[PDB]
Amino acid sequence: MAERGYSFSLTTFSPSGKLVQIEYALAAVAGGAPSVGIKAANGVVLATEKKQKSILYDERSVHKVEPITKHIGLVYSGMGPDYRVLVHRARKLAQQYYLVYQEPIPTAQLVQRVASVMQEYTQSGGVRPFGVSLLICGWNEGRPYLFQSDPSGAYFAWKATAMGKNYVNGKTFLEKRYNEDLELEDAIHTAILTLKESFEGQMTEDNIEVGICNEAGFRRLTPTEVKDYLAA
Amino acid sequence: MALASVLERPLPVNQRGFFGLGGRADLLDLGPGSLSDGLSLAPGIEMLHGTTTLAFKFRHGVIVAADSRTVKKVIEINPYLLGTMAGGAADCSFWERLLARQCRIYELRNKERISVAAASKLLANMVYQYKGMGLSMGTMICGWDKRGPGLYYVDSEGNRISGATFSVGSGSVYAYGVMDRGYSYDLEVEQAYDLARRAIYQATYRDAYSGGAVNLYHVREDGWIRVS
Amino acid sequence: RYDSRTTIFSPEGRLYQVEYAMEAIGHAGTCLGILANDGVLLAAERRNIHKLLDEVFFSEKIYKLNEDMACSVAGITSDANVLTNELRLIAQRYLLQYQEPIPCEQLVTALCDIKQAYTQFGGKRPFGVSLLYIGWDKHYGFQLYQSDPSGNYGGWKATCIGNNSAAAVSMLKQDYKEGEMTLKSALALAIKVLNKTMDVSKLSAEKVEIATLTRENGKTVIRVLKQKEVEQLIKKHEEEEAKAER
Amino acid sequence: MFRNQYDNDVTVWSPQGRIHQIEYAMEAVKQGSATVGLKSKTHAVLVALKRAQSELAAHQKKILHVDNHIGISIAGLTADARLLCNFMRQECLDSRFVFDRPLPVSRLVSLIGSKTQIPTQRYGRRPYGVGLLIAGYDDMGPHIFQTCPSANYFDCRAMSIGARSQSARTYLERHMSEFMECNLNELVKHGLRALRETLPAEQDLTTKNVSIGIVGKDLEFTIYDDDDVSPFLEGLEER
Amino acid sequence: PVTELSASGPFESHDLLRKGFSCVKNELLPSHPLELSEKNFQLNQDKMNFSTLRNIQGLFAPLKLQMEFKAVQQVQRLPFLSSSNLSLDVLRGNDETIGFEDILNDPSQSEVMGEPHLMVEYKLGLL
Amino acid sequence: NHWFTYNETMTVESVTQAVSNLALQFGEEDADPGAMSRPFGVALLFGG
Amino acid sequence: YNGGAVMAMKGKNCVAIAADRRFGIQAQMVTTDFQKIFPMGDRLYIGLAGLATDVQTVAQRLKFRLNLYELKEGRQIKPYTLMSMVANLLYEKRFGPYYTEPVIAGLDPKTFKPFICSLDLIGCPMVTDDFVVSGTCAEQMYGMCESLWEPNMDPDHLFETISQAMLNAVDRDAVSGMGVIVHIIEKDKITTRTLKARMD
Amino acid sequence: MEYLIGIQGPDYVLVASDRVAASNIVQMKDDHDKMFKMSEKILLLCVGEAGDTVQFAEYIQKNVQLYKMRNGYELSPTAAANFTRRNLADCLRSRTPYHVNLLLAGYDEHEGPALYYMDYLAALAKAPFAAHGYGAFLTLSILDRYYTPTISRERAVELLRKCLEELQKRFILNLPTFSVRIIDKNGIHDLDNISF
Amino acid sequence: SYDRAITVFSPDGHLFQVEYAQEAVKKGSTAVGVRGRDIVVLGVEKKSVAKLQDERTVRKICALDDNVCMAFAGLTADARIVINRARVECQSHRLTVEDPVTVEYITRYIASLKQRYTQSNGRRPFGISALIVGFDFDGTPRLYQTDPSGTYHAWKANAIGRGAKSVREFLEKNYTDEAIETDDLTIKLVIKALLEVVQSGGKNIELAVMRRDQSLKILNPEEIEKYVAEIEKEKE
Amino acid sequence: MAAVSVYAPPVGGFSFDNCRRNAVLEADFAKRGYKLPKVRKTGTTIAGVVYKDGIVLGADTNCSKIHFISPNIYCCGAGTAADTDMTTQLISSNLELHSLSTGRLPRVVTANRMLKQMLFRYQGYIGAALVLGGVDVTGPHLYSIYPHGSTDKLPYVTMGSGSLAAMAVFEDKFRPDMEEEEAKNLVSEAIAAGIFNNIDLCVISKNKLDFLRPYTVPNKKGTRLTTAVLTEKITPLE
């Protein structure tokens, strides 16, 4: 599959205008672990599937659902190291915004700055795109936000979405069950169900990760809280 | 070695002789009598100084005249361009040697001679770059180009004045006076006035140090001449 | 001789990578700009029309750059974000230095110099973005420019970029009346063209965003039409097409 | 045949463990014209064959002056020889400036070795295509050094480099047992006979095609050319 | 009194309209004690780190750090557009600290930027 | 430059040597940017 | 040289910002009569007392940053955020400051709650809920503002009080050619009045 | 010992400047033009140091002309005033003591006349009348006493003569010949030198 | 041994990438420049005009200073870059030496910029050729031409672009001293040369003249049509 | 716009323009009595002690001189007001980044290092003299950082105008391992002895602070707390 070398360079358009090395970076996202974001009427839900699924993992060590500030939180599907490098950058950008304006960064502003970093990585040559698509959940101005930034650096505002493996079926599932008036609790139920759609066997509180964002701010649910949600 | 070379710093650690926040650093600063001679681009308190000069434009040229003689009071920039001295001797000589270098490079490139406006402007730029650093120039660029006779006063303080009568020095006040002239003086009558004016300086002195005749000059159309 | 770099001419003088960059827009949504006697407009097709997409910033495609200018991109979206940010920066830098709003063609020229720099130095992908600018300045009045990935701009009285730009341009060239355009007739023509060139679906005031620029009492008014007005324009067009049929 | 992927760059090791651009640079040395260096107990002479297209041109300047005690004879690319000669001259100046004494020949040659080793490891470079015969005189006596495109240097009793220099080296190996007690005249004659051995049986050494450079205990480095070589060539028996 | 007039050879040429207002008269004594300490701070910090690496570990350590810095700084954005220095910060260790260079006088909104081609070919050493 | 520094005319061979120092500096592009990166495609004939 | 004097007071759902004007003056040297109060928004103003050149530079750079912020965020700036932007700029000098000292006086475009502030030349803000003063006459300006300010004023009482404080502060028995310009920001309108002491 | 002065009328701007370039280490005729033509309808009057003023005004002139060449139209008097203010601010901070006092006069078809004062610290102020140099306060007091917005070109010239003669009264000095120029919808016009 | 690299000679000794940039020049609209006695004229064909276009924005004749002018053929974006650099250089030269650029000085600068871009195979040459007309400071009319390689020459009349060969043949056969006596004859000779490649003439022709001591003046379509009508009358 | 005079991209940080201009201008104005604007100072008594399981930090008041750096670390400042504000804000955001990566609540030594190295970098030209104090897994730590970049780890410390009276009170009545009330009263008493010719109090206690739960971002709120006329003109808007 080497279209005259249009396939191997990041800075070469194909004769049809495609950039078929940024869509191969979108195939790294669509081969990552499933993620779900559901923007309820009073909060956002970020549920993902953990790759650290065996008993030998310290679960106070490394997490896939991360906070950026008190009110913004991320999940990803794709390549984990790229996520970590972008997460530390997003945290720095949020703190620079606070230091300048004395106000927490809005979700849209953070998404824009992170997407500009990703875009930079898709244009030089001698470098490689990011293999992660992020979901950013935030709460500003009494209004939830759910965004998605893909490896190309093009972000989208969503009501509900699904990433990672089996995300077309996940989005089809979400379309049939999302309604705007959904409350955050029913959103958590729906997000766990959408993960349960494309999941490799029995789902425990220790092989999925959930993080919510409401008025009180972004918070990652503890394994007991996820256990309680799964039991219902 | 190849890695430090691929890096192209050069910084005093990726070298040889580094033993702290610096050390010998490839020769403890010791180097060579230059790496490049000249022929390429690359505490002494007793500098020398000057005294009295005229210059007027004309109908037939521009006429420099200086307080006799020894010492030098008029720099001979090139066959078609003249200049006087005031202030530091080294300053005037060096910066107008650089100007003559520029004028000759211009003539070689463009196949026509530089104009007086351009030459005086180049000099004014060169000495304006180091304004306030103690350069002492009082030159007075005169020549003849496609626009006719040219006369400019260029200074180390950034001044560059065009004019048809200039005078620098001690007898300047008496020499600018006595400059009762006309743009249509005959050549002999012009030599007359410049002689008389340097004289009305020295009607209170006589031949000696910065004393002698008048070191007269004359910038014709085909280059200057020395009248006497 | 070949098309692997932007810094290589084919043996007939063609820069093939720039031509491929310009081929990316023909996929993007149809952006349309029309110049009238009393205003300018930008009609843009809402490409992202999925069910679960959120209600977003005041416009997906239309961006404000000044008090006096707006743009409407078509092509790669991330490059477009970078370019609109730099447009706003360029305009504020002109205002800072001269204390006057930037004239429209000077902004277009500056951005197109940026785009050309990316088509000239090797190891840098050109911007797959074609922009469409509308504005007002004290020199030339209402202006409408276009720009393409090669950094190559031009001023128009009606132009289209994006999907089906050629059919739209043929229709505008047939129906745009030079000198006798008002903003209402320009809006009617915009709906008509943007209808006949969006024939993948039936036109509705949820797949189009329209922004008009006018001058009211000495200030420019960039206004993005509300969803309840674009419906009225679409009804006016449908009733007109019913009358013109029988 | 299996060699094409591994010989286009000096940064590629061939699966036999060989850099091939280094060997091709050594060939570039062989493409010059023969020059000979030999030393006695008191003198170090450099003899070179000049080509001038055989008519209408001043011959190549094949023996160059580096310092009062160092001179070099070149074979190979001329641009590289000039770059290396500029380096040698600058290093000799630096030694005289900082330390007031003539730079030792061995130290200079070591510096050349490092300088010419860097291109044979780095990207975007090529080895130096010139080989030198450095004749020096310092506190340790006469010296003859041979530098290579591979960045190797050798301490020689005598050496010939260039095109068809194997014949000169055969002569020098045959006759090196008597070089040390030779005086200047017959040492230069020995070098001349070796250089002649690098020629067809018909051609003979003339003043037009022979350049000589002597350094020694009393001499500073002097180059003899085009009419100054006549005292040395007059006494050279036929072949 | 700085000496150094290369004046042996003060033949250098400048672009008058682009040099702006340069005053070599006062370009020998910084305007503030902190002017150069802040201008060259990442430079001096790199030099301090390379010096300690050299003195403790060897030539290889600064060489590898400089080689990584050179590599990441080269897949970048053309100089007339602001870059993020994401990989360079991860290498230098500034991915989790905010200094005053980060919040004051933001480079992303410069208030002044030159021509694209002039800034690119100045970075290339062409003037 | 030679006239400025030494107050005399540069000889023919010295001019040719300076031009040669400029002309032999190709390849090695990432060492002194503004260098040439290929041989000059011109032969000169200095006659003086 | 006289830097000037800029003042701000709070009323009930209304703010006032005032500065002196110098009606009659034929002074010389550095500029004296400059523009001090700049609209930074629909209901947001900044007063800038100090060196005239630095007042203009600060106003222009502030408008640069504010225009960029409002385009990127698509929202009208808030008074406290303007305070923080002004502080960030002033402090990015800090070693060589701008000789200007601002006051922000505006209305928040959500609840139209008054906000007043005053920074120094390197940007240390002081947010009070009664009045601020900024200039070379801060001592008697403060005394007069303390003596006259009453809580929960209305637009007319606000105008009267701020005019009295400015006039009787710059007084020095020298209100001759001394003017006062007063902007009264309210939820509905902005009323600018330029006034003189009756003595003249 | 420099003098600048400007009077703006309903459709014209009248400026005057003395012709002395003393620089008294050299003897020369006055002849000195302190007004630089930035464009077809803009004048920059500059007084201050020797050499530092001509260089600054020429830099500004080249940048104004470059704007015209690139853009096809000219900078307005206000945009040229603000560009000058920014550049004088940049030059005043690069170049230690740098006293360049400016007075920009101009005309715009869609803005009318425009006079701009600018002190040695680069604080631009649009003014109806202005003056720099010696006795500036006294000229300003006279102008303020007598300047009316609808003043005529002839009356403005006569008021200018009043200012100069009344400065000659208060200060017993030479008062050299003053270049006088006017800017109206037809460009810069030279008027007769005020000489006394 | 091929093209595809800017700095690689072919075994015949050809740098083909520069020659392909000149191929890029040979596709642009024809630009004709004629040097007269006291007027210098420039004319470019308006190839495939679109009715819904502001023609002010797609002009190919530009003023570099008050005495120098320039028309180009090739890629228009490269031309915009080169033109604006030339404008800055004209003003900078005036700042350096006070004198207006001679037309050769700015031709040399433009060629040096193009020649900088023909080095370093990490850069791309400018695919434009320019016709720089003007008047020197002493009043001599000039006409120069640069090409992508960095090579410039002085001409009496010239054509660049597509159909430059036919127009240059016409100019050689028709440029005499009797075609230059008046300003009008120079203008009509440029229009006649352009009518050799332009179909439906007059509306596809962009004239701009520059008389001595005067600025560039673009001729509006009315004046151009009057000149074309005069030409057809002179055809009889 | 593309300025012609720009070759290299601008950078960020402190500006150092106006430096020579301000030097000449301040020398000129001081020779005429013109009173350029000055910076605000916050010289007031700030004091702190370490009791058995925490620290108490105190200050004078109408303002708020006790800054927030971490849920477990707090700071008082004397010197230039803007300098203490900006210094503590920058170190607070750095410690937020540090804690948010590590998942641990910060250490007082980390804050001390950041402060002292930042204050050393700006060679005493940032006038922030601070009384840092907090509580980590290691225990209560009290520091006093000085504007030139020198710290001092102490059991009790005082700064400001009444520092000598308060230091005398501390040397009189400080004992290792006091109770929260005893230490609170001692800090208040030292401040009061330093003011007489209200008092803020920050109490960070070890048993009000969990160092085993993962760190989560705290929520923040904010700070900073006749004659007749003749109206010549009026102009309502909107």
Short mmCIF file of N, CA, C and O in Angstrom, two decimals, chain A residues 44 46 65-75 83 87 90-91 93-95 97 103-114 134-140 145-147 211-220, chain J residues 96 100 217:
data_model
loop_
_atom_site.label_atom_id
_atom_site.label_comp_id
_atom_site.label_asym_id
_atom_site.label_seq_id
_atom_site.Cartn_x
_atom_site.Cartn_y
_atom_site.Cartn_z
N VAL A 44 -20.98 16.55 32.23
CA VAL A 44 -20.40 15.74 31.17
C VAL A 44 -19.83 14.48 31.81
O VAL A 44 -19.43 14.49 32.97
N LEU A 46 -17.07 11.22 31.10
CA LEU A 46 -15.98 10.68 30.29
C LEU A 46 -15.68 9.28 30.79
O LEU A 46 -15.08 9.11 31.85
N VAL A 65 -8.07 9.07 32.58
CA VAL A 65 -8.96 10.20 32.75
C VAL A 65 -8.25 11.18 33.67
O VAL A 65 -8.01 10.87 34.84
N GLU A 66 -7.90 12.35 33.15
CA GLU A 66 -7.04 13.28 33.84
C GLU A 66 -7.71 14.62 34.01
O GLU A 66 -8.50 15.02 33.15
N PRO A 67 -7.44 15.34 35.10
CA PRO A 67 -7.89 16.73 35.20
C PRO A 67 -6.87 17.71 34.65
O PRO A 67 -5.66 17.55 34.82
N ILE A 68 -7.37 18.73 33.97
CA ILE A 68 -6.56 19.84 33.52
C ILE A 68 -6.56 20.97 34.54
O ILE A 68 -5.51 21.49 34.91
N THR A 69 -7.74 21.34 35.02
CA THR A 69 -7.92 22.32 36.07
C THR A 69 -8.96 21.75 37.01
O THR A 69 -9.19 20.54 37.02
N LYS A 70 -9.59 22.58 37.82
CA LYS A 70 -10.69 22.05 38.61
C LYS A 70 -11.90 21.74 37.76
O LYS A 70 -12.71 20.90 38.15
N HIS A 71 -12.04 22.37 36.60
CA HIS A 71 -13.27 22.28 35.83
C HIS A 71 -13.11 21.64 34.46
O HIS A 71 -14.10 21.55 33.74
N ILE A 72 -11.92 21.19 34.09
CA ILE A 72 -11.68 20.60 32.78
C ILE A 72 -11.03 19.24 32.99
O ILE A 72 -10.19 19.08 33.87
N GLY A 73 -11.43 18.26 32.19
CA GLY A 73 -10.85 16.93 32.29
C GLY A 73 -10.79 16.26 30.94
O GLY A 73 -11.61 16.52 30.06
N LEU A 74 -9.82 15.37 30.79
CA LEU A 74 -9.53 14.71 29.53
C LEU A 74 -9.70 13.20 29.64
O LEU A 74 -9.54 12.61 30.70
N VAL A 75 -10.02 12.60 28.50
CA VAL A 75 -9.80 11.19 28.24
C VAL A 75 -9.31 11.12 26.81
O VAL A 75 -9.44 12.07 26.04
N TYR A 83 -0.68 11.20 24.54
CA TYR A 83 -1.65 11.76 25.47
C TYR A 83 -0.97 12.41 26.65
O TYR A 83 -1.34 13.51 27.05
N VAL A 87 -1.18 16.25 27.72
CA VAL A 87 -1.84 16.57 28.97
C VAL A 87 -1.01 17.54 29.79
O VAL A 87 -1.54 18.50 30.36
N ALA A 90 -1.41 20.85 28.15
CA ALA A 90 -2.71 21.46 28.39
C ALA A 90 -2.78 22.04 29.79
O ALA A 90 -3.36 23.11 29.99
N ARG A 91 -2.19 21.36 30.76
CA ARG A 91 -2.13 21.90 32.12
C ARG A 91 -1.31 23.17 32.19
O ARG A 91 -1.70 24.14 32.86
N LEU A 93 -0.87 25.31 29.71
CA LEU A 93 -1.62 26.36 29.03
C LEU A 93 -2.74 26.90 29.90
O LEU A 93 -3.01 28.10 29.91
N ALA A 94 -3.41 26.02 30.64
CA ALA A 94 -4.44 26.46 31.56
C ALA A 94 -3.86 27.34 32.66
O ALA A 94 -4.47 28.35 33.04
N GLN A 95 -2.70 26.97 33.20
CA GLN A 95 -2.12 27.79 34.26
C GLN A 95 -1.59 29.12 33.73
O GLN A 95 -1.61 30.11 34.46
N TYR A 97 -3.05 30.78 31.29
CA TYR A 97 -4.26 31.57 31.19
C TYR A 97 -4.67 32.11 32.55
O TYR A 97 -5.04 33.28 32.67
N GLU A 103 -8.51 34.13 35.89
CA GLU A 103 -9.75 33.40 35.71
C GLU A 103 -9.42 32.04 35.14
O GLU A 103 -8.46 31.91 34.37
N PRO A 104 -10.16 31.00 35.50
CA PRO A 104 -9.93 29.69 34.91
C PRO A 104 -10.16 29.70 33.40
O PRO A 104 -11.11 30.32 32.91
N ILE A 105 -9.32 28.97 32.68
CA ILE A 105 -9.43 28.97 31.22
C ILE A 105 -10.77 28.37 30.81
O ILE A 105 -11.24 27.42 31.46
N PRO A 106 -11.46 28.92 29.82
CA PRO A 106 -12.65 28.26 29.30
C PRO A 106 -12.31 27.00 28.53
O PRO A 106 -11.21 26.84 28.00
N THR A 107 -13.28 26.09 28.47
CA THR A 107 -13.04 24.82 27.80
C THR A 107 -12.69 25.02 26.33
O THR A 107 -11.79 24.37 25.80
N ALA A 108 -13.39 25.93 25.66
CA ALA A 108 -13.14 26.16 24.25
C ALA A 108 -11.76 26.75 24.02
O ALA A 108 -11.09 26.39 23.04
N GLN A 109 -11.31 27.64 24.89
CA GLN A 109 -9.98 28.22 24.73
C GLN A 109 -8.90 27.16 24.88
O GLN A 109 -7.93 27.13 24.10
N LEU A 110 -9.04 26.29 25.87
CA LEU A 110 -8.07 25.23 26.04
C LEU A 110 -8.05 24.30 24.84
O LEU A 110 -6.98 23.91 24.36
N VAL A 111 -9.23 23.93 24.34
CA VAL A 111 -9.29 23.05 23.19
C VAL A 111 -8.61 23.69 22.00
O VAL A 111 -7.89 23.03 21.26
N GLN A 112 -8.81 24.99 21.81
CA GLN A 112 -8.17 25.68 20.70
C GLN A 112 -6.65 25.64 20.81
O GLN A 112 -5.96 25.39 19.82
N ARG A 113 -6.11 25.91 22.00
CA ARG A 113 -4.65 25.95 22.13
C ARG A 113 -4.02 24.57 21.96
O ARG A 113 -2.98 24.42 21.30
N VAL A 114 -4.66 23.54 22.52
CA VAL A 114 -4.16 22.18 22.32
C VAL A 114 -4.22 21.79 20.86
O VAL A 114 -3.29 21.18 20.31
N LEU A 134 -8.37 13.49 21.66
CA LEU A 134 -8.78 13.79 23.03
C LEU A 134 -10.28 14.04 23.10
O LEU A 134 -10.89 14.48 22.13
N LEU A 135 -10.87 13.75 24.25
CA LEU A 135 -12.15 14.32 24.66
C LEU A 135 -11.92 15.24 25.83
O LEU A 135 -11.37 14.82 26.84
N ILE A 136 -12.34 16.49 25.69
CA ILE A 136 -12.21 17.48 26.74
C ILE A 136 -13.60 17.73 27.27
O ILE A 136 -14.50 18.09 26.51
N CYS A 137 -13.80 17.55 28.56
CA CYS A 137 -15.04 17.93 29.21
C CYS A 137 -14.76 19.10 30.13
O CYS A 137 -13.73 19.14 30.80
N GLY A 138 -15.67 20.06 30.14
CA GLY A 138 -15.49 21.23 30.98
C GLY A 138 -16.83 21.76 31.42
O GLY A 138 -17.87 21.37 30.91
N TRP A 139 -16.78 22.67 32.38
CA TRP A 139 -17.97 23.36 32.87
C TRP A 139 -17.62 24.83 33.01
O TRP A 139 -16.86 25.20 33.90
N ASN A 140 -18.19 25.66 32.15
CA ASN A 140 -18.03 27.10 32.23
C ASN A 140 -19.40 27.73 32.15
O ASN A 140 -20.29 27.22 31.47
N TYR A 145 -19.48 21.50 28.55
CA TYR A 145 -18.81 21.46 27.26
C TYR A 145 -18.22 20.09 27.04
O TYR A 145 -17.64 19.50 27.94
N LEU A 146 -18.37 19.57 25.83
CA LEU A 146 -17.69 18.36 25.41
C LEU A 146 -17.09 18.63 24.05
O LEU A 146 -17.80 19.00 23.11
N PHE A 147 -15.78 18.49 23.95
CA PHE A 147 -15.05 18.75 22.73
C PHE A 147 -14.28 17.50 22.35
O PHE A 147 -14.11 16.59 23.15
N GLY A 211 -14.90 9.61 34.57
CA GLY A 211 -14.70 10.90 35.17
C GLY A 211 -15.81 11.84 34.79
O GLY A 211 -16.16 11.93 33.62
N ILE A 212 -16.39 12.53 35.76
CA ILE A 212 -17.52 13.40 35.50
C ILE A 212 -17.10 14.85 35.72
O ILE A 212 -16.09 15.14 36.36
N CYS A 213 -17.90 15.76 35.18
CA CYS A 213 -17.67 17.19 35.31
C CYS A 213 -19.02 17.85 35.51
O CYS A 213 -19.85 17.84 34.61
N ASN A 214 -19.25 18.40 36.70
CA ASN A 214 -20.48 19.13 36.95
C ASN A 214 -20.16 20.49 37.53
O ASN A 214 -19.01 20.93 37.44
N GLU A 215 -21.15 21.17 38.09
CA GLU A 215 -20.93 22.48 38.70
C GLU A 215 -19.77 22.45 39.68
O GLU A 215 -18.96 23.38 39.72
N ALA A 216 -19.68 21.39 40.48
CA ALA A 216 -18.64 21.29 41.49
C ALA A 216 -17.26 21.13 40.88
O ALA A 216 -16.26 21.36 41.56
N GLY A 217 -17.17 20.71 39.63
CA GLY A 217 -15.90 20.60 38.93
C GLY A 217 -15.63 19.18 38.48
O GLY A 217 -16.37 18.25 38.77
N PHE A 218 -14.54 19.03 37.75
CA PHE A 218 -14.17 17.73 37.22
C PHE A 218 -13.66 16.83 38.32
O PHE A 218 -12.92 17.26 39.21
N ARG A 219 -14.02 15.56 38.24
CA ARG A 219 -13.71 14.59 39.27
C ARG A 219 -13.67 13.22 38.63
O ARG A 219 -14.49 12.92 37.76
N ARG A 220 -12.71 12.40 39.03
CA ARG A 220 -12.62 11.03 38.54
C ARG A 220 -13.28 10.11 39.55
O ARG A 220 -12.91 10.12 40.73
N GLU J 96 0.84 24.02 41.69
CA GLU J 96 -0.32 23.32 41.15
C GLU J 96 0.06 22.37 40.03
O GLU J 96 -0.43 21.25 39.98
N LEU J 100 -0.28 18.40 40.43
CA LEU J 100 -1.24 17.78 39.55
C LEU J 100 -0.57 16.68 38.75
O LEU J 100 -1.21 15.67 38.44
N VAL J 217 -7.51 19.23 42.55
CA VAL J 217 -7.35 20.68 42.43
C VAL J 217 -8.32 21.37 43.38
O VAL J 217 -9.52 21.06 43.38
#
